[PDB]
Amino acid sequence: TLDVAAQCFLNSLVRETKDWRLTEYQPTQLIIPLGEQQALHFRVAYFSPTQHHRFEFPARLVTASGSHPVDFATLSRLIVDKLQHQLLLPATSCETFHQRVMESHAHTQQAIDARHDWAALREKALNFGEAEQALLVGHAFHPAPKSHEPFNQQEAERYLPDFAPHFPLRWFAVNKTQIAGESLHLNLQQRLTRFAAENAPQLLNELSDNQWLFPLHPWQGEYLLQQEWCQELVAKGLIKDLGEAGAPWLPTTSSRSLYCATSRDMIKFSLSTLSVKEVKRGMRLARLAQTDDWQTLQARFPTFRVMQEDGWAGLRDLHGNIMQESLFALRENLLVDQPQSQTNVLVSLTQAAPDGGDSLLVAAVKRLSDRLGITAQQAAHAWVDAYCHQVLKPLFTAEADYGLVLLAHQQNILVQMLGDLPVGLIYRDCQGSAFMPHAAGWLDTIGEAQAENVFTREQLLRYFPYYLLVNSTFAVTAALGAAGLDSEANLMARVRTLLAEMRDQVTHKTCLNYVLENPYWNVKGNFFCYLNDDPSVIYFDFANPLLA
Amino acid sequence: TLDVAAQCFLNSLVRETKDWRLTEYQPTQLIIPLGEQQALHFRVAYFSPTQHHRFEFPARLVTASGSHPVDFATLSRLIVDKLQHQLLLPATSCETFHQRVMESHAHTQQAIDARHDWAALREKALNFGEAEQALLVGHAFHPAPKSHEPFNQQEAERYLPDFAPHFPLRWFAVNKTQIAGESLHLNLQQRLTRFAAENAPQLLNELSDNQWLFPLHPWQGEYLLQQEWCQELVAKGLIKDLGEAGAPWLPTTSSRSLYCATSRDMIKFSLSTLSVKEVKRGMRLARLAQTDDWQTLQARFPTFRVMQEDGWAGLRDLHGNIMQESLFALRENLLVDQPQSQTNVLVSLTQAAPDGGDSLLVAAVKRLSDRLGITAQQAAHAWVDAYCHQVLKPLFTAEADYGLVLLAHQQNILVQMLGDLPVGLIYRDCQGSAFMPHAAGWLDTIGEAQAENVFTREQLLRYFPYYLLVNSTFAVTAALGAAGLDSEANLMARVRTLLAEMRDQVTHKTCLNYVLENPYWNVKGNFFCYLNDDPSVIYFDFANPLLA
Amino acid sequence: TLDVAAQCFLNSLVRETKDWRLTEYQPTQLIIPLGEQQALHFRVAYFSPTQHHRFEFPARLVTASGSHPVDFATLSRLIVDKLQHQLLLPATSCETFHQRVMESHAHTQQAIDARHDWAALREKALNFGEAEQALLVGHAFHPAPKSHEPFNQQEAERYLPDFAPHFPLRWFAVNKTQIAGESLHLNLQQRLTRFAAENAPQLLNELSDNQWLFPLHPWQGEYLLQQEWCQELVAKGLIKDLGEAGAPWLPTTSSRSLYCATSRDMIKFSLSTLSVKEVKRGMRLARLAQTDDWQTLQARFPTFRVMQEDGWAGLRDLHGNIMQESLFALRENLLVDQPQSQTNVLVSLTQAAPDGGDSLLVAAVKRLSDRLGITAQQAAHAWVDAYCHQVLKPLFTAEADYGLVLLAHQQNILVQMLGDLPVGLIYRDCQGSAFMPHAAGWLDTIGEAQAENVFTREQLLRYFPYYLLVNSTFAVTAALGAAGLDSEANLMARVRTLLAEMRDQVTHKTCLNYVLENPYWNVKGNFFCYLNDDPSVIYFDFANPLLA
Numbered sequence A, B, C: 001t002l003d004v005a006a007q008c009f010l011n012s013l014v015r016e017t018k019d020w021r022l023t024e025y026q027p028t029q030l031i032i033p034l035g036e037q038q039a040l041h042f043r044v045a046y047f048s049p050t051q052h053h054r055f056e057f058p059a060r061l062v063t064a065s066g067s068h069p070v071d072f073a074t075l076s077r078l079i080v081d082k083l084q085h086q087l088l089l090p091a092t093s094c095e096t097f098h099q100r101v102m103e104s105h106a107h108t109q110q111a112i113d114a115r116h117d118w119a120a121l122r123e124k125a126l127n128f129g130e131a132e133q134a135l136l137v138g139h140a141f142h143p144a145p146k147s148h149e150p151f152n153q154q155e156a157e158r159y160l161p162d163f164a165p166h167f168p169l170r171w172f173a174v175n176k177t178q179i180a181g182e183s184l185h186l187n188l189q190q191r192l193t194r195f196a197a198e199n200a201p202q203l204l205n206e207l208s209d210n211q212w213l214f215p216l217h218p219w220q221g222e223y224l225l226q227q228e229w230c231q232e233l234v235a236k237g238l239i240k241d242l243g244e245a246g247a248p249w250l251p252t253t254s255s256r257s258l259y260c261a262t263s264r265d266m267i268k269f270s271l272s273t274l275s276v277k278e279v280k281r282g283m284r285l286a287r288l289a290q291t292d293d294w295q296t297l298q299a300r301f302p303t304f305r306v307m308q309e310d311g312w313a314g315l316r317d318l319h320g321n322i323m324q325e326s327l328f329a330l331r332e333n334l335l336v337d338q339p340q341s342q343t344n345v346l347v348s349l350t351q352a353a354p355d356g357g358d359s360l361l362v363a364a365v366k367r368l369s370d371r372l373g374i375t376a377q378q379a380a381h382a383w384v385d386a387y388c389h390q391v392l393k394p395l396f397t398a399e400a401d402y403g404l405v406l407l408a409h410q411q412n413i414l415v416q417m418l419g420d421l422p423v424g425l426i427y428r429d430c431q432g433s434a435f436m437p438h439a440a441g442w443l444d445t446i447g448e449a450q451a452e453n454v455f456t457r458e459q460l461l462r463y464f465p466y467y468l469l470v471n472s473t474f475a476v477t478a479a480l481g482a483a484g485l486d487s488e489a490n491l492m493a494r495v496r497t498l499l500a501e502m503r504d505q506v507t508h509k510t511c512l513n514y515v516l517e518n519p520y521w522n523v524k525g526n527f528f529c530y531l532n533d534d535p536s537v538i539y540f541d542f543a544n545p546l547l548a
Helices: A004-015 A072-086 A091-114 A118-122 A128-132 A153-159 A188-199 A201-206 A218-226 A228-235 A276-288 A292-300 A346-350 A360-372 A376-402 A437-444 A457-482 A488-504 A510-517 A527-531 B004-015 B072-086 B091-114 B118-122 B128-132 B153-159 B188-199 B201-206 B218-226 B228-235 B276-288 B292-300 B346-350 B360-372 B376-402 B437-444 B457-482 B488-504 B510-517 B527-531 C004-015 C072-086 C091-114 C118-122 C128-132 C153-159 C188-199 C201-206 C218-226 C228-235 C276-288 C292-300 C346-350 C360-372 C376-402 C437-444 C457-482 C488-504 C510-517 C527-531
Strands: A029-033 A039-046 A054-062 A067-070 A167-175 A179-183 A211-216 A239-251 A257-259 A265-269 A304-306 A311-316 A322-332 A342-345 A404-406 A413-418 A421-427 A433-435 A520-524 A539-543 B029-033 B039-046 B054-062 B067-070 B167-175 B179-183 B211-216 B239-251 B257-259 B265-269 B304-306 B311-316 B322-332 B342-345 B404-406 B413-418 B421-427 B433-435 B520-524 B539-543 C029-033 C039-046 C054-062 C067-070 C167-175 C179-183 C211-216 C239-251 C257-259 C265-269 C304-306 C311-316 C322-332 C342-345 C404-406 C413-418 C421-427 C433-435 C520-524 C539-543
Touching: A004 A029, A004 A054, A004 A072, A004 A091, A004 A527, A039 A072, A054 A072, A067 A072, A072 A091, A091 A527, A118 A360, A128 A239, A128 A257, A128 A342, A128 A346, A153 A218, A167 A201, A167 A218, A179 A188, A188 A201, A188 A211, A188 A239, A188 A265, A188 A311, A201 A211, A201 A239, A211 A218, A211 A322, A218 A228, A218 A239, A218 A322, A228 A239, A276 A311, A276 A322, A292 A376, A292 B376, A342 A346, A346 A360, A346 A413, A346 A457, A360 A376, A360 A457, A376 A404, A376 A413, A376 A421, A376 A457, A376 A488, A376 A510, A376 B292, A413 B413, A421 B421, A433 A437, A457 A488, A457 A510, A457 A520, A488 A510, B004 B029, B004 B054, B004 B072, B004 B091, B004 B527, B039 B072, B054 B072, B067 B072, B072 B091, B091 B527, B118 B360, B128 B239, B128 B257, B128 B342, B128 B346, B153 B218, B167 B201, B167 B218, B179 B188, B188 B201, B188 B211, B188 B239, B188 B265, B188 B311, B188 C188, B188 C201, B201 B211, B201 B239, B201 C188, B211 B218, B211 B322, B218 B228, B218 B239, B218 B322, B228 B239, B276 B311, B276 B322, B292 B376, B342 B346, B346 B360, B346 B413, B346 B457, B360 B376, B360 B457, B376 B404, B376 B413, B376 B421, B376 B457, B376 B488, B376 B510, B433 B437, B457 B488, B457 B510, B457 B520, B488 B510, C004 C029, C004 C054, C004 C072, C004 C091, C004 C527, C039 C072, C054 C072, C067 C072, C072 C091, C091 C527, C118 C360, C128 C239, C128 C257, C128 C342, C128 C346, C153 C218, C167 C201, C167 C218, C179 C188, C188 C201, C188 C211, C188 C239, C188 C265, C188 C311, C201 C211, C201 C239, C211 C218, C211 C322, C218 C228, C218 C239, C218 C322, C228 C239, C276 C311, C276 C322, C292 C376, C342 C346, C346 C360, C346 C413, C346 C457, C360 C376, C360 C457, C376 C404, C376 C413, C376 C421, C376 C457, C376 C488, C376 C510, C433 C437, C457 C488, C457 C510, C457 C520, C488 C510
Parallel strands: A304 A421, B304 B421, C304 C421
Antiparallel strands: A029 A039, A039 A054, A054 A067, A167 A211, A167 A239, A179 A311, A239 A257, A257 A265, A265 A322, A311 A322, A342 A413, A404 A433, A413 A421, A520 A539, B029 B039, B039 B054, B054 B067, B167 B211, B167 B239, B179 B311, B239 B257, B257 B265, B265 B322, B311 B322, B342 B413, B404 B433, B413 B421, B520 B539, C029 C039, C039 C054, C054 C067, C167 C211, C167 C239, C179 C311, C239 C257, C257 C265, C265 C322, C311 C322, C342 C413, C404 C433, C413 C421, C520 C539
């Protein structure tokens, strides 16, 4: 049996602590001592060199008297008690931590009960929107991944991707004086006009030189009209609420971010939160993408694309102050012309399946196997190799030759597949971009050398390898390992060899050297991080499995 | 102005003769002496290092008196007179040659007059069937490419791809005794059943244990019922003609070969001609594709696919003799599940445009340029580079590491594109396959070591580089050169560099060494070849443009 | 608030009993006396002249002391106690009845909890398969509609339309000796071949002169292999189980009947039950549909179609006995060529919505209103009028002029709509057909005059008006009444007028006279019928609302 939410709490704990035992004898068990001649025993179904373990449940508690099973509420409390005393922590922040752990475990269990169609996602190639909504648990190494903030069941079933919903946007007619924002190619007025024409043309009778159409998340729209600064604007005749109208939008893995298959733009709302600084990161990268060196990079990696966030807008109050709770940014919908593209977000492919069966990555590889007439293992190798050439090669070369750092969270990576094989990469979330000192000459050509989002070498090596290799790439290899298509050790040797070849084709070797040569990667953890809101406990040393 | 049919006759002549002049001064002219103080002058619009020239017409004839224009009938006759005397040739075979040259020039001109929709093919990505029927002249270096044999206008407008037609197949109910053939996966009876169920289910009331459904080309069907051996079978009750029925089929570049978007099989008819030996080449390669080494090759190049010809059938007469005029072979329709795939046959992309505008390759590259925001030249480089990795790399590695020779006529190469960029290769026409001595151990595992279709080293070097580089790859580079996206010299340097890297990744270097190092490629020509039906005139030495 | 399952039990009770009270004063209440100075009170949200009432819950129980709410378990038990004593019934059959009432109420409540997507079905025109699976409660006047027999949750979530599932069929290779059945147009062998080729072509390697492919429901397949007679066939080499394979099938309102959008045939399984006599009714009507009078009828009503059941098959045991638990019948898929047709089963349109909002009929009419720019009420009138011309006119004229009786259960009527307006009728379930004495001459032309499924005049008037007017037509008018688009009295006056015109266009007036003129329709009820497994209690007199 299994419990996927529980497995996240345990794999996160095991990855960030040294005090556990792995039995030499079989049936293999993993043991967490609790002190007091007491310890939790877990039958191991899959032991992972990267801590993507799968345990059989129930857990058992072994005392001096005997052993008895324990449910997840009990084992998580025992563990948090041990850490409370071991680390001398406030009982209050421990109670908060365990409370949040149990809420996430309930939110996750309910999302599973609602999605009885999930297994059927294994049947055929998923398109972009199907992949965005196939994600039931999004953080495999977080104690409490799923939070419904800020919704309430009925509101959570309409607005969270967990439940595969869709809905129309809410709209205001807003006086041009109360609208702030920017846009590339089209100015702001033309962007709001094109957006409204595509997604709610029937409101175009409300559009004038001075009255513009302003989209809103439906919950966030309700929320703003309850605020006082916004009721003033309504009273003064500067905002008229138009209600919900237009094409269906569906929440993606981010939930603030919405996809509409017929809109040239995706949309990302401040949802109870964007900031003006965050949207400036999008505009900076968008303006940087107009330069000749960006063009040279694109010409070198034609299958590699960034979804630019080249427009944003927000509501000003009576004093002219931009009210950040009203912000949105606009993201190029590179899939508007091919809405059935097999472009899938990496985290949905790699997540463990709620029913214990094949992950959606594994289902894709087995179809690859069948279509080509090659073994499961040979398909697994072909998919890992293409992943490295389509995902890892552009991202390392971009940092190395151009100074552009793109933080590749697993939900920021869209694998463009053709017949279940990676043929391209699309990166999204331009707020996860940063610039190295050797990009300064190139930032300066657009007047952005003093850009706020720069990295030191130390920051590069702390985050970029952690997101791209630990979180993203080893989710691919662990997921293929757990299905037995081949082992993680063998699949990570694939990756190691293809990274070594890449190093030969780049100028600045610093990042690949660390990846290929340093025995430990100091990375910022999640389990103890979230138990705050200690010093060397939030950070931990990750043993490099790529080292010769 | 221009004349594409004429340009084929001249470029073929110029490529296989040394007796012409290229003026040092401008406007650039190409001069062919005719003897007798007489010579043809051609204003040159595009001079090509690989002889893909484009001339402005009319041609002019320069005598001691003056110059006057000449039409294509006159210049082709003057040229054939000169070769008649220069080579002391029979006036009869020269008259035949010029007669066939003029018929091809008329057939080509009529195909142009019928296809007024052709320019609109530039507008968007073509799918497989659109690309197959976009071909108006298929042999850029043949004196007389277009022959309508064996049809007559109305019959040529229904059965030739030139006119973009479609039609249903003709069908016989045939006694099992009079059917010969084979099939893999399904036996012959199950293949004829699956074929008829998919393409003419309404004839399934004619299907029994002993009476099987037998497809026929519609013209070839009419032809066989006029024959005597077949009227006997009808008289004896062994064949009942069922007429034409079922799904629409459209002729491809081959015209004998038909495509139906809903059939799992394509079909290739003996058309007035297949032979039993030819279809055995398909079955041999199909059986070879079941082995573990084929599997290893497929796993190494997952984007590379062969359309196997793993079934065939034919009619036996009363004596049991297979009547080859009734043969067909069945070709996997790898596009049945994705009929809108941008998989396009290479010759349709590279052909010169009948109206003098962009070739369909160039239209695709300009869209690539626009979608990615890179220059025309940068898109041309990206497309050449992907072509080498998707087309040239699998074909050289297959010969080198496995001993499998696939003769890559330009109409045998299907470029699988995604957004106008090559992402894969599909090879078709298994009759153009052959085996090298180092494939004997592997042929022997399926009992095929004594296979009729083997090559010597000499045959490898005469044909494989000519088809893959001279005909296919330099059609790509010349076509991009002629549009001015960049020069052939620069684009062929791209190819040279990517071939050198390939040599490092293969065992048997013989074929790449010749490609990269020999200064001349002795190849079998077309212009003088077709003037027969002399010894060292059919062959000529091609100067290697890839040599350092 | 409301409870749709409860509303079925109460509306069924109220329709078949005279002992209730409707308060003259408001808020309107409906009162059911329980005897003993005790009675159930229901606040009425919608009072219906045809008993399609909607009550607000909770119910209340009023005693001599006071009143207190009661849940559905309590009020259904009180009612069944009263009927037990009032009718002097066995306590055992009353306990069984209440047990089944509560199970249906639970099965219905769970189907609602699973379908959170249901409200979104209101958004746009439904196609055939969406409409088949939109049905959560199928019998508005039955005490216990939903039974899961014979499944168990996980099996019920895979095989019942309530949960919108889909699945592949299970398949046997069966020796021709052990297959019985028939088919029109194609013989049985050709039908099983065409069916298997379309839906599981990859099993065609198992198809031979003597070994035929035999489809099975997946649960029914498992069930037969557990039986002894079938294990013998496996032991003797006469049946080889091939497992599940092929295209997805989805259960329709019947659950035994499956739809596959790409199959030319629908399929109807004996599921734990068809009989040979039942499938002979299909073949008889199918053979009758080949005659010239059928043709004349079709030519008179071109928008009226019957889905013929013109083939069936079953497994014989070692003794040659047809094992009816293996039967299936094959139903023409008239939608195979237009799978997005807005053809919807009438019961899904008319059912009350689980969330208390618009029924799917009402959603369609409101879209009709919007598209045409006419009021909601004018659209309701247009839809009722077209319903009468497209549904009622063909069915009465068929009985009257041809003697063909088609029993129009609401789930047997497919309303072919174009832009939310009825433009045609498709009838299915040929087992609900019967023949009047004046069809004997026409039955005799196909040798079927002694047909088992004939009606007397008495049977005609008991069933045909009940199914076509009480169940089907008044579900349409009540559903439009309950939304307030116009009243049932006014909408039933529409129907009355259009029926009177029909009578002028037909020969045998007997059925329309009864519909238009008799003050009471004696009909067979459901509430007390199902309390058995009394004499004049199963039957009741329905007051004709169409009487002048």
